[PDB]
Amino acid sequence: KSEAVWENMARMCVKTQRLDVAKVCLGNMGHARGARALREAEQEPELEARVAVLATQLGMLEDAEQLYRKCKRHDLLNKFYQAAGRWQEALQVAEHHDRVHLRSTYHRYAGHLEASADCSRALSYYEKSDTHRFEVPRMLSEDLPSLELYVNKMKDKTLWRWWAQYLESQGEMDAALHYYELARDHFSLVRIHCFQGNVQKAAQIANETGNLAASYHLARQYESQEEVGQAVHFYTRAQAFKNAIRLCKENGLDDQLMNLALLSSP
Amino acid sequence: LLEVTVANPVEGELPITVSVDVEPNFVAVGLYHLAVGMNNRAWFYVLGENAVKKLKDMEYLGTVASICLHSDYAAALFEGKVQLHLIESEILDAQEERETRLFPAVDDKCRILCHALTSDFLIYGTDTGVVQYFYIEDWQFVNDYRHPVSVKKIFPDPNGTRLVFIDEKSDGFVYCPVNDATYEIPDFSPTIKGVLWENWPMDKGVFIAYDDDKVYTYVFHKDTIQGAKVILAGSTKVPFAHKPLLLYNGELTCQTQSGKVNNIYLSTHGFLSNLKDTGPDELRPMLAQNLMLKRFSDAWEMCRILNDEAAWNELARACLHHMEVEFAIRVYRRIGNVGIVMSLEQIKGIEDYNLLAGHLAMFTNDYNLAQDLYLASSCPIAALEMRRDLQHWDSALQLAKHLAPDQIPFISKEYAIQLEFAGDYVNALAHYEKGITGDNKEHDEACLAGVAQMSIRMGDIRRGVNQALKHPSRVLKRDCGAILENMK
Amino acid sequence: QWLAENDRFEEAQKAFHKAGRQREAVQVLEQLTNNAVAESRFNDAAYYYWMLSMQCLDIAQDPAQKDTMLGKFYHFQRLAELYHGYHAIHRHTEDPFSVHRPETLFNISRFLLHSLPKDTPSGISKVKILFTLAKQSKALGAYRLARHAYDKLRGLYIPARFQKSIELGTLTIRAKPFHDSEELVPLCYRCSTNNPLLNNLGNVCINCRQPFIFSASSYDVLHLVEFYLEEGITDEEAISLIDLESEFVPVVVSRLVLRSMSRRDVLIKRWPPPLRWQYFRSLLPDASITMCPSCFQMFHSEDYELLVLQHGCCPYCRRCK
């Protein structure tokens, strides 16, 4: 009942690629974590990967790395390198063999850098993936000057949208309109123009840009302003034929109802 | 005699000296107010940035034992009763029922011994042992706790939810209304005069209890593997007549007898000094202190300074003990322990408190505690799994009678197998015959072969060879021939 | 394979399905789902899971593996619904601003709470779901669902960035009138009763056990009751008839009643041949529910129009209009 003896012969079992007698070993040395890892690895349709997993639980990381390389499971070796914290051999494994977890590897490395207070490298490796639009606004929270500098620098037409949403929910209507106009989010332009009461320039924006959502919202505002004819016309422009025909039925514009109903959905 | 100095050095506000009308008997300061008073009168001043201006000099029925200020509300304790009122009592569409109230109710024949005032609550302890929360915003009692003995003193934390109270027996407790429980403070000195909570935003659990001789630094471990508890972290001697006022990031602004504040650095928080000149033999106790205070970031910094793998393992074990999965993942990833990093990332998204507690207890090789936590979780069978993974077949059989009875046969057979390999054939026979099923033909045949071998080795040779005949497997005959050769 | 080597992996899946392939396509799409869930792109994860369900249903046309994989179709459809719902909750608790209405967040959080399994799928943290449910129920006026949410939150490990708000809300919620606003009470439509905002049975009624029908955009009990067909009625016959003029017991309609019904208040949901069509009767024919011809998800008509105009595609399955 000596734990060192069991550990030694478990390492020997690693050397011999036999795990059935190993599986009953690292439950006798008190290594519950390793037994659980073996149980989880049993689902793999391979034998080299399972022995590599057992080696990882026994230490001997070089043997497990070589066995993963021999197994050709480059995804498992990538995860092994990430877990080991090398973060550079994992990058090369992703760039050479995975090619599908490459963006996932970039995201995980950037998260590791962020946890290590390396904000700039985290920004760079978020940029290497498509997730920076999602991550940098979260990652630069409570750092609004840096966040607006990054938003102005990148010009991603969605970082502008995110910043404009923030400014709108920060009492910054003018800057919100500026950034929405940069982001070409015509729906927000029309919405805030109607909300502020200046409906004419909203109508001009809808007419010029042709944004379907902007025209729909503007015509909804018209239908809420008791004006119907313009509301019907700008439902027609926004291809919102259902609201248009409902309004025509309400106001009894049968002649206007026909032209909308003919081209409407069945 | 007639001066009160109000300052916020942490936020950089310059000290402001206010000359009051009379020599105050009690002084209290809130976010926006300063109430100084004596006997049954209390003067309120609004602490404007440039200068102050007294609003009112209010009258109270009894001798104002104490007063508390916060937000726009003031609660004055006098004659065993707390009057809670507004300060800028503007009669402008303001409901009368929320402008002033008296505690306790007229029917309650109890006296208020201690009262406090947080940003949201009016907390007070009565001579009957009752601690009651009173949500000011909604004007309703939200918590009623009944301590066995009267609560002499209460000190809420800056978060305003968790409290520390001292009763008649000088027994300090930490009270949490969220889970509604009291955890006794260990080594609470009988003659402790006051308690100051930590104000640094990232030291939630830390607080200190001071008397005229020492300042004891305690830490409340809200989330640990072994349940919530209070742990004494250290002690720091303080000079004569130094009543502490403020505690910020381990620095104590304590009031002297000259009306001048002074700064004292706590022994537990003595690491705020330079760390490059400090030797490793001095960092190791410093690292233990930082680990005890749940200061994991500073512990990481000082471990990086040490560059000793034992220190990193100490930090990581502390992180696992305190239910900090992400930081433990960080520390193990830096160390290089791949297997445990992957195991942690497997449970990274676990939300059940007891299940995660059991997982992190098993990761630290405490299987009894891990099982005890697993049974209380929402996935009890996990315990069986680890007991099955630890080859603890007796314990696995004990658990499987409740959680998974369908695994009762298989596990039992495995038990017998171990009993067979340990030479304890008597119990091996019993568990083999107890491991029989009615569906798995191969399992039943294996169990029957085991029963045959055991019965043969029991000297019950007739029955053993009887089951030997009725098993369709030549390998059983092959090994049974050797067994009979053993009995010759 | 050329697209895979060129990193057009979503295009690679599109190609693998366009050509003949049912082994590399499924594994690459599973890897795409794992990448999405590993990141925070939960709407993308839901879309990928929906395509997994659609592929499993399509290649279940083979009778050899029909039974073992229609279950996969159902599982992936349910995961798609869960992830598409949870994307909004994930966005709400991370962005400094709010995009959805408080009513929508309340409904989504309630639907996730009821439909989320005991073993929560990967990435879905139910602490955020319960926290959002508590906040929205407190705001909208359901001061009894908030109490339940806080009681459940007391039994879960709370991230350090949620502890203050949750452990203060658990305290300040005891001051509320202890009542659920009638404007939020779900209303079963077969037996016109009022169900509790929390149902132990899930998203199911109390008196009867008709399952609820939720709008896929802003979750809401649609005025739809699922009815089945008699054993001996075919779907084409069903449509032809329609065009003319404890112990859950399904409302199995007859041929004569189908002759009485009209196409203006029945949603047929024409599943592929491996599955029979699911018929829904609208008890409020004045209002209109629209279906996406793919994914068959049901939205309020005005909400569907607005979302398609804003997006250019179905919010659920990004098919171009």
Ligand SMILES: [Zn+2]
């Ligand atoms: Zn019903």
Ligand SMILES: [Zn+2]
């Ligand atoms: Zn769709």
